[PDB]
Design a protein around this motif. Sequence first.
Motif, short mmCIF file in Angstrom:
data_model
loop_
_atom_site.label_atom_id
_atom_site.label_comp_id
_atom_site.label_asym_id
_atom_site.label_seq_id
_atom_site.Cartn_x
_atom_site.Cartn_y
_atom_site.Cartn_z
N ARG A 11 0.84 -1.19 0.00
CA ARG A 11 0.00 0.00 0.00
C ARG A 11 0.88 1.24 0.00
NH1 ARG A 11 -5.31 -1.47 2.54
NH2 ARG A 11 -5.69 -3.56 1.66
N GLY A 12 0.36 2.32 -0.58
CA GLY A 12 1.03 3.60 -0.59
C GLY A 12 1.58 3.96 -1.96
N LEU A 17 6.47 -0.17 -6.87
CA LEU A 17 7.91 -0.32 -6.77
C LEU A 17 8.28 -1.38 -5.74
CD1 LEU A 17 10.62 0.99 -7.87
CD2 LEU A 17 10.55 2.43 -5.80
N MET A 18 7.63 -1.36 -4.58
CA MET A 18 7.91 -2.37 -3.56
C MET A 18 7.63 -3.77 -4.08
SD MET A 18 6.41 -0.44 -0.26
CE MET A 18 6.89 1.25 0.08
N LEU A 19 6.49 -3.96 -4.74
CA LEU A 19 6.14 -5.28 -5.25
C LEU A 19 7.23 -5.80 -6.17
CD1 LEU A 19 2.80 -6.68 -6.54
CD2 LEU A 19 4.77 -6.65 -8.07
N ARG A 20 7.69 -4.96 -7.10
CA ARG A 20 8.68 -5.40 -8.08
C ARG A 20 10.03 -5.66 -7.43
NH1 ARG A 20 9.55 -1.14 -11.02
NH2 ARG A 20 10.64 -2.29 -12.67
N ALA A 21 10.42 -4.85 -6.45
CA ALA A 21 11.67 -5.12 -5.74
C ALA A 21 11.63 -6.46 -5.03
CB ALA A 21 11.96 -4.00 -4.73
N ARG A 56 9.73 -18.14 6.10
CA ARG A 56 10.97 -17.37 5.99
C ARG A 56 10.78 -16.14 5.11
NH1 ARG A 56 14.22 -17.57 1.95
NH2 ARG A 56 13.41 -19.61 1.28
N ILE A 57 10.13 -16.30 3.95
CA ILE A 57 9.95 -15.13 3.08
C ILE A 57 8.91 -14.18 3.66
CG2 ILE A 57 10.64 -16.53 1.12
CD1 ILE A 57 7.69 -16.34 0.16
N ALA A 58 7.97 -14.69 4.46
CA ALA A 58 7.04 -13.80 5.14
C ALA A 58 7.79 -12.90 6.12
CB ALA A 58 5.97 -14.61 5.87
N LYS A 59 8.67 -13.50 6.94
CA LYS A 59 9.45 -12.72 7.89
C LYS A 59 10.38 -11.74 7.19
CE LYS A 59 11.02 -14.54 11.58
NZ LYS A 59 11.77 -15.34 12.60
N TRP A 60 10.93 -12.13 6.04
CA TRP A 60 11.87 -11.28 5.32
C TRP A 60 11.20 -9.99 4.84
CZ3 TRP A 60 12.53 -8.81 0.74
CH2 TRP A 60 13.82 -8.41 0.40
N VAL A 61 10.00 -10.12 4.27
CA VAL A 61 9.32 -8.96 3.71
C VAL A 61 8.76 -8.07 4.81
CG1 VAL A 61 7.39 -8.22 2.26
CG2 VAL A 61 8.79 -10.17 1.58
N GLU A 62 8.20 -8.69 5.86
CA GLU A 62 7.61 -7.93 6.95
C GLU A 62 8.66 -7.12 7.71
OE1 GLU A 62 5.75 -10.97 9.20
OE2 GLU A 62 3.92 -10.99 7.99
N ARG A 64 11.32 -5.70 6.48
CA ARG A 64 11.85 -4.63 5.63
C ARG A 64 10.77 -3.72 5.06
NH1 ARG A 64 14.83 -8.96 5.73
NH2 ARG A 64 17.12 -8.85 5.51
N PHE A 65 9.57 -4.23 4.84
CA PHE A 65 8.43 -3.44 4.37
C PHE A 65 7.30 -3.68 5.36
CE2 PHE A 65 10.56 -2.99 0.26
CZ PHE A 65 11.29 -4.16 0.20
N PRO A 66 7.34 -3.05 6.54
CA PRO A 66 6.38 -3.39 7.60
C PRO A 66 4.93 -3.06 7.26
CG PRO A 66 8.28 -2.23 8.51
CD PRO A 66 8.38 -2.11 7.01
#
Length: 75
Positions: A11-12, A17-21, A56-62, A64-66
């Motif tokens: 969101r925002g 950009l966040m999705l693609r990164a 693991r990927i859930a924790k990674w994204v959360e 860095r992109f809270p």
Amino acid sequence: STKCVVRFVFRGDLATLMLRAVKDHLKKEGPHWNITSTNNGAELVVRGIHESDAKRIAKWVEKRFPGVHTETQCD
């Protein structure tokens, strides 16, 4: 074996950009993963991954992109 779907909703002003990164990062570590985009490029869906990787990927994204919304559903 158990398989899982993980959905990220960004969101925002920078959501696309966040999705693609994040998609770039996940494809580097899982080039074979079923990763698609929905919701006008704001929702990222990763299908058919093991539970260990989904968490693991859930924790990674959360971390860095809270502000992302994260849903994990396993089978």
